[PDB]
Symmetry: D2
Subunit: 165 residues, 4 copies
């Protein structure tokens, strides 16, 4: 039984629902799925000031634990065609995992929300830099087709990863 | 035993050597490897005029046959950060393969030569549009490290594809 | 009075209307505007077979004439996130214009139609490779907002180019 | 006399030298040049711990002041093909400048250092989203050709910006 990390960042909750949909779908694929969220840079104070809606009970992920799983799904809010600062900051910390060859041949996939395509591509590229195998896409609040897409995607990744083990 | 297509385009021979290195490596991975070249647009006349060095005995590929293989490796010469016109023209013809879902979940990989990164990304994206699983890179005449990279890449793809069957 | 080239490629006419809207808008900016279309690769025969709707009276452009204008607007149909083969083939021919430094500091802009963003970016990059100054975007048949966007864009480019002379 | 902001981020000093070279070159173009650095996220403590070499006397920039200048040059260190977290975090804060139309038609340019091309493109795109006119590139420690490139680029931007006023 393969283990999967559904790591995500959301600012307004949209991506979190996508992440949960992907995780639930991945469980249907027969994988031990873990839903974590990237740590918030900038202090706990003045963070929930103006705009905010981060979830509390989603556990925070560590840059080093990413080598423990067989498959990683990354979903992030994006602006102006690139990752949010929080997700970018987190992935740069996997420098010890990169040279070690830790994430080589591990299965990966990406979800994004709002420059959507450029953001999707930028994120996939960073995962490819760690030698990860990439599983492509589908083909206010998330629509029914988005949630189904994330769900299918999540199951498809779990289904592929198991086939590799 | 999986079947692989090493499809390529080369203008000065560099990519052809890369293609042959990838094919040979893929055979070592235990796959029935076929080395084809995309058809040359513009007539046979005035084609070999100024600059030219296309290989004759490499068989020409058809847009429709791409669904016959389990894995496809694409290698192309690039200019100004994008595919050569010949490779772009060929892949657009796979419109019947796209909607049919023919190339979904088939394993793929890309090699490029000279805007290298943008070209590598543009090509991978088109393959992802057909729902192909992507296997990332290595990590005058081709250097020893390039040929070894293409070789390893070719074997790695064949090795992965077999694991999926 | 600056001279502008509105060069385009269209397969179903959408981009041609965009091109005409950009040209008309550029005339309102006070520029001698020329509307040309990239030459069609593959023979005149079997070209208008299945799908076709290229315009006859739009004059065909030559790869070398691009250095005659002060501003160039490029508009192209795109598939799977990149240029159409016809536009890509044409721009690669500007190799004599590149090393000569012919297109350096000339004003340019891009329009695309259907991978839209990746295509827009890929095209702009090739123009930047010739050292062209880039003017960014707006911010069945073309909608009223698309035509107005192309129109404004066309005028804005003409308005900028004149300011540089 | 136009005013220019040479805003930058550097982790090991390479980009700072590029920034200074661009600023000095821009002064030779006849512009009031201001050299600022993006604020460092994460507290002052444990920041200079392991690796560090940020410059003290370079003044820190504010997200809102970017509308005060006529030209903006952005130079940033990059990893895995995208901006550093610090530069990305800063530019997202220009949301009030975007909808206001503050940065429209202002001249801009980008420098990067180490995924170089993808990073250069990602950054330019964000500037284009604010409607900024883009001036393309050249065509341990920075080499003589890099410094000359940044210098020329800096002067070229100042030279162009003045022509627009």
């Amino acid at each position: 039984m393969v283990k999967m990390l559904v790591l995500y960042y959301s600012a307004y909750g949209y991506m979190e629902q996508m992440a949960k949909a992907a995780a639930e779908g991945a469980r249907e694929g027969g994988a031990e799925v873990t839903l974590k969220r990237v740590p918030e840079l900038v202090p706990e104070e003045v963070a929930k000031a103006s705009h905010y809606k981060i979830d509390q009970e989603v556990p925070i992920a560590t840059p080093g634990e990413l080598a423990d799983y067989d498959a990683i799904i990354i979903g992030t809010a994006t602006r102006y065609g690139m990752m949010a600062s929080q997700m970018k900051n987190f992935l740069d910390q996997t420098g010890g995992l990169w040279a070690k060859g830790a994430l080589i041949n591990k299965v990966g996939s990406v979800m994004v929300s709002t420059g959507a395509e450029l953001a999707l591509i930028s994120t996939q590229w960073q995962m490819q830099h760690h030698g990860m195998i990439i599983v492509p896409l589908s083909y206010r609040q998330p629509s029914a087709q988005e949630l189904d897409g994330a769900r299918f995607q999540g199951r498809r990744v779990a289904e592929i990863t198991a086939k590799l083990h």
